[PDB]
């Protein structure tokens, strides 16, 4: 299967990404508390629902929340301001709150059923969000000996996500609040002066440079 690419809403960030975030891949956004990781996730949950000529994939969404940060009214606002129906957009997002890291791991395995269910409909699942990917593992696996044990369980969780991305042609997008890392692509996000947000690719020897965008009623835009 040819790769699909989901626009972020930022044409500069889309250029860094070669067109958008890719299916058959795990994209990690990481940065300090407050840098906009969850806003980028909200914006992507709408953009994927657009038709391809508008940067989407006519796709459904599955969202795993670990910090109670998902906001349906934010989804509806972004949808409305980009020309889509707010309730229809909300309807095509499946939502789960992970109670702990072990619940988080079972929810990903359980997601394969709905993915198969929607696969050959007109709105197959095209985006799987995990926000936050690491917060539960950080609180549960801590102290002497936890570095190896935590990285092992996290590697298996990420392996499960890679398999779903590749088997079913899905883009996986994960956040991490800031060690080896397993994601396909890592994006560093930070706040700038004057309400700007700045993104940069990490340890990706393609495009060099930084994208600068704002958080708006459309989600994000340059």
């Amino acid at each position: 299967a040819t790769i699909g690419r989901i626009s972020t809403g930022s044409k500069s960030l889309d250029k860094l990404l070669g067109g958008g975030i890719e299916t058959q891949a795990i994209t990690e956004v990481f940065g300090e508390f407050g840098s906009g990781k969850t806003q980028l996730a909200h914006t992507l949950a709408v953009m994927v629902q657009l038709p391809p000529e508008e940067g989407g994939l006519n796709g459904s969404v599955m969202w795993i929340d670990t910090e109670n940060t998902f906001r349906p009214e934010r989804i509806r606002e972004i949808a409305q301001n980009r020309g889509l129906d707010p309730d229809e957009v909300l309807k095509h997002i499946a939502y789960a709150r992970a109670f702990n890291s072990n619940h988080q791991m079972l929810l990903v395995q359980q997601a394969e059923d709905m993915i198969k269910e929607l696969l050959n409909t007109d709105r197959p699942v095209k985006l799987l969000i995990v926000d936050s990917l690491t917060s539960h593992f950080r609180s549960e696996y801590i102290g002497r000996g936890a570095l190896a044990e935590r990285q092992q369980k996290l590697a298996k969780h990420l392996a499960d996500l890679h398999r779903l991305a590749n088997l079913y042609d899905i883009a996986v997008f994960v956040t991490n609040q800031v060690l080896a890392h397993s994601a396909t692509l890592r994006v560093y996000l930070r706040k700038g002066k004057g309400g700007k947000r700045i993104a940069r690719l990490i340890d990706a020897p393609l495009p060099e440079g930084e994208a600068v965008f704002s958080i708006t009623e459309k989600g994000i835009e340059d």
């Binding site: 349906p72 989804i75 309807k91 939502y95």
Partner: peptide, 4 residues
């Protein structure tokens, strides 16, 4: 899992 539930609908948003």
């Amino acid at each position: 899992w539930h609908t948003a």
